[model samples]
Target: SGAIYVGNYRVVNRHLATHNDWANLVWEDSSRDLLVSSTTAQGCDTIARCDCQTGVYYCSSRRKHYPVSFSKPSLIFVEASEYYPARYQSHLMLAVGHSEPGDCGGILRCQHGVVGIVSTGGNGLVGFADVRDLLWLDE
Candidate 1:
């Protein structure tokens, strides 16, 4: 069920990565590429539902220590805290390409009429974290 209706769109579409606006816990199979980010607090506060697959780098989605400086990932999963403690339940905005030139990742707010504070120019996109998105349902 949808928490709020903004326009002519199915609030909870079984298909994410295509919906206009919605909140879903993004997920990723441990067997993907590098899942990187620049949020240290988030990594330390919640548990991730992914496991590393490759051999070069393998890390749990829980208690991850982000770069001390700041960074982003090439293709990281943007999902909500599907586990306990629900650290993030509201709408979130993603900010990438901030510190490392073209590589970027950031979390902003979109719930309660709050747009967001960060922007990655047109190169970046803002959308819902559809639960189905965790499955990497994209073109």
Candidate 2:
């Protein structure tokens, strides 16, 4: 659980996988097989990997704050947020939304199902895949 993976995202100027001067992993440790399972964000609506088994969640964005609109509510809402890190490469932008009752997800997605994945492009914000499947409520 002490492993970090820095993604070479174009937005991320500096390295993320290799933080704290701990660049480069040598695959040491003789534990037969390495196990790295993704977890979901729990106790908060922050961004994080999902745990497939128990359905529990674990935050990873490290903001320690989750959006209230993401709660199991019966209403819908929408908003946006942006941030920039050092090195001019670590920049992130997000638009959170809440689905309207008896509709789909808060955002309009090409696919129709549960709110799956949130996507961003030059155009604007959009969510599809499955994150907003059953909550695609829109006007």
Candidate 3:
């Protein structure tokens, strides 16, 4: 099994979608005592709108001697011409028209902060798994 590391903490667990397309990693040091606040939004109106500024943040593979590049692209939410299946029940997913193919798992940040995680993309749209619920746990 693959693992993720952030700083000194290693990923020890995860919450994964049944479709095998998205996940949220839990670090070994995770605790409510160490929680840090960040801005997040819910649903389509808050996080999705035509032409609203958004960015997909992810690390790219090393190119020869270059280190892994931390990269993000400035983009906007577009009106998707078709609907894509949501990866989890009742989890709102948004589609963007310009994300790269390998961008799944990248953080989708809007003006407010992180709004979703990239799930899958094709046929002119990239799907994002809404993660606002993870912040509040109300749903």
Candidate 4:
């Protein structure tokens, strides 16, 4: 199971079928399917058609198939070298978690056992942190 967006509804990989070879598809009410048969390449990128009535996966190339997942738009941000304007620097630092850890100002998501930032909501910074270390900041 990859990622599926049924019109704003973000379905993680756990709910749907993982790497199914029948057909990669999305049902009207949020049903989904994916062919997990990719053998030789990294991605097959095939179009899986589903019957409106039967609701099954069907495609010509069944070689590469498995776990359907999917991402987002552009990363709009100008990054300078080590030197940056004070105002922008603070913003960048916060976004990329420069001096901090796990304070990423975005939504955290886990897929296929991997933790990642799905969206940053224009801040464009995602990372992991722990409170134990930060507690010692004053010590």
Which one wins by lDDT: 2 or 3?
A: 3
In candidate 2, stretches whose alpha carbon ends up further than 4 angstroms from where it belongs are 1-54, 62-75, 82-139
Tens digit of lDDT per residue, candidate 2, span 1-139?
Answer: 1221212211111112234222333222111111112223222222223212112111232312223222221222223324212211111223343221111112221222122222222233222222221211220
Task: Score each candidate by Cα lDDT.
Answer: 0.23, 0.22, 0.34, 0.22
**Which model scores highest in lDDT?**
3
lDDT score of model 2?
Answer: 0.22
Tens-digit lDDT track of model 1 for 4-76: 1222222222221222232322332222211211221221111122321111110122222221111222333
Best by TM-score: 3
lDDT of 4: 0.22
On a 0 to 100 scale, what is the lDDT of residue 65 in model 1? 21
User: TM-scores of the models, in the given order?
Assistant: 0.16, 0.16, 0.37, 0.16
What tens-digit string does per-residue lDDT give for candidate 3 at 1-139?
1122223222111232222222332311111101112122333223323233345444232111111222233223333322222222233344445454344445555555555455444565655544444433221
Off by over 4 Å in 3: 1-90, 136-139
Instruction: Indicate the worst ten consecutive residues by lDDT in candidate 2.
Output: 8-17
| Residue pairs whose backbone atoms clash in candidate 3 | none
Candidate 1 regions exceeding 4 Å error are 15-75, 78-139
Q: Summing lDDT over every window of 10 consecutive residues in candidate 1, give the lowest-scoring window.
A: 52-61
